[PDB]
Swiss-Prot record, chain A:
This is Nitrile hydratase subunit beta. Belongs to the nitrile hydratase subunit beta family. Its EC number is 4.2.1.84. It catalyses: an aliphatic primary amide = an aliphatic nitrile + H2O. It comes from Rhodococcus erythropolis (Arthrobacter picolinophilus). One of its GO terms (molecular function) is transition metal ion binding. Industrial production of acrylamide is now being developed using some of these enzymes.
From Swiss-Prot, chain B:
The gene is nthA. Fe(3+) binds at C101, C104, A105, C106. The keyword Magnesium does not apply. This is Nitrile hydratase subunit alpha. GO terms for molecular function: nitrile hydratase activity; transition metal ion binding. Oxidation on Cys-104 is essential for the activity. Inactivated by nitrosylation of the iron center in the dark and activated by photo-induced nitric oxide (NO) release. Inactivated by oxidation of Cys-106 to a sulfenic acid. Heterodimer of an alpha and a beta chain. Its cofactor is Fe(3+). It comes from Rhodococcus erythropolis (Arthrobacter picolinophilus). The modification Cysteine sulfinic acid (-SO2H) is found at C104. InterPro entries: CN_Hdrase_a/SCN_Hdrase_g_sf, CN_Hdrtase_a/SCN_Hdrlase_g, CN_Hdrtase_asu/SCN_Hdrlase_gsu, Nitrile_hydratase_asu.
Length: 212, 197
């Protein structure tokens, strides 16, 4: 999904709000901040109501201005609440009644997702690959900066995982794939307008094709 | 008009989500309290610092950490949520590694700790992939042009830690002494370990 969450490469932001080894304070800066991840784990591991991938996608589905003005942990309160409503566990009415006011949610998905691709290639370290030039309106773990770009395989994982574009929609056809550390030259991704060297993206096999 | 939507205070929303689920019997006794303690007290960059100090003083462990990071971390018992498939990436005299999750905040939680606000910021997520040398410079870390910067974007299930170079002036230090100079920011890659004057 080509949402505002796909931030890598966006220009116009200021300084990162940190200098090295500065005090970051406690893990949680407010008494509620442990709730979004704890209740996410209740949903995934105790209730079996959704996957972690569905949590990433529901946050991507926040209305774009809402995403941009919401602090990180609050986005996950909103996302987990949204999934509880969508899965039929909670109602928005009871959330708003308990909260004492408005509790707007992420927007409905506009894609049913897609299955793990049937035709893929096992790549080896050192091979040249291109990121498939494809547009996916639902969840995908491919940042747009690498779509269509060529890089080299530095690692093939020794484990396999469900394809995000299916499991992030709760589909039954996510299969399993390994992922690949694909190293891109900085100039492949941003031409002359970069000061870096290389970028390594960890890409599911189903996002890749042989280069040429 | 681009205005924000009306919202109840976030604390009220987050506790409403808790109470809605808890009141239905869906949240075990002590469950969110248990996770809070794990997040605060167990998931910690002191673990990644222990791994770095071991690698610096034990060439066999260094090789294992760099070839099978999951197995190396498992010897210490530090595998966990958001830290099951671990890859450690080695800095060298010509290479500086830096980690980000441009799409969200993905981090090797058990051995780096939960990510800090700055790492989750839109500024870091947008900028470090494109201009890591300037971002590090602004953060207080100068990386010379003779060094390639390599940014790892945590887009799948690999969870990374940086193995920084060991600084001069630490020859013969104990693992405990070495651990102290390996900070969270050294494990993420935006800092280089510092030795006191
Ligand atoms: Fe993330
Ligand atoms: Mg975009
Ligand atoms: Mg209403
Ligand atoms: Mg055919």
């Amino acid at each position: 999904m080509d949402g505002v969450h796909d931030l890598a490469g966006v220009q116009g932001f200021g300084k990162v709000p940190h200098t090295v080894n500065a005090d970051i304070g406690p893990t949680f800066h407010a008494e509620w901040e442990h709730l979004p991840y704890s209740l996410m784990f209740a949903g995934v591991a105790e209730l079996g109501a959704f996957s972690v991938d569905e949590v990433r996608y529901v946050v991507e589905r926040m209305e774009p201005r809402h995403y941009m003005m919401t602090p990180y942990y609050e986005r996950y309160v909103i996302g987990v609440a949204t999934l509880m409503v969508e899965k039929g566990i909670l109602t928005q009415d009871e959330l708003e009644s308990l909260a004492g006011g408005p509790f707007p949610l992420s927007r409905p998905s506009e894609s049913e997702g897609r299955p793990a691709p049937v035709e893929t290639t096992t790549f080896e370290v050192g091979q040249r690959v291109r990121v498939r030039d494809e547009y996916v309106p639902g969840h995908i773990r491919m940042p747009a900066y690498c779509r269509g770009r060529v890089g080299t395989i530095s690692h093939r994982t020794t484990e396999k995982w469900p394809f995000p574009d299916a499991i992030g929609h709760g589909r039954n056809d996510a299969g399993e794939e390994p992922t690949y550390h694909v190293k891109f030259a900085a100039e492949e991704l941003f031409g002359s307008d970069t000061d870096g060297g290389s970028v390594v993206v960890d890409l599911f096999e189903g996002y890749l094709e042989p280069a040429a | 008009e681009n205005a924000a939507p009306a919202q109840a205070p976030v604390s009220d929303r987050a506790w409403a989500l808790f109470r809605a689920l808890d009141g239905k019997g869906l949240v075990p006794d002590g469950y969110v309290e248990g996770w809070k303690k794990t997040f605060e007290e167990d998931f910690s960059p002191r673990r990644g610092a222990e791994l770095v100090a071991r690698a610096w003083t034990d060439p066999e462990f260094r090789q294992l950490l760099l070839t099978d990071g999951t197995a190396a971390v498992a010897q210490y018992g530090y595998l966990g949520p958001q830290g099951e498939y671990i890859v450690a990436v080695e800095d060298t005299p010509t290479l500086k590694n830096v980690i980000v999750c441009s799409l969200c905040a993905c981090t090797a939680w058990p051995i780096l700790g939960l990510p800090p606000t700055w790492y989750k910021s839109f500024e870091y997520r947008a900028r470090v992939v494109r201009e890591p040398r300037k971002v590090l410079s602004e953060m207080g870390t100068e990386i010379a042009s003779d060094i390639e910067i390599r940014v790892y974007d945590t887009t799948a299930e690999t969870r990374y830690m940086v193995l920084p170079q060991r600084p001069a002036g630490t020859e013969g230090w104990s693992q405990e002494q070495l651990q102290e100079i390996v900070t969270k920011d050294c494990l993420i890659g935006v800092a280089i370990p510092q030795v006191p004057t």
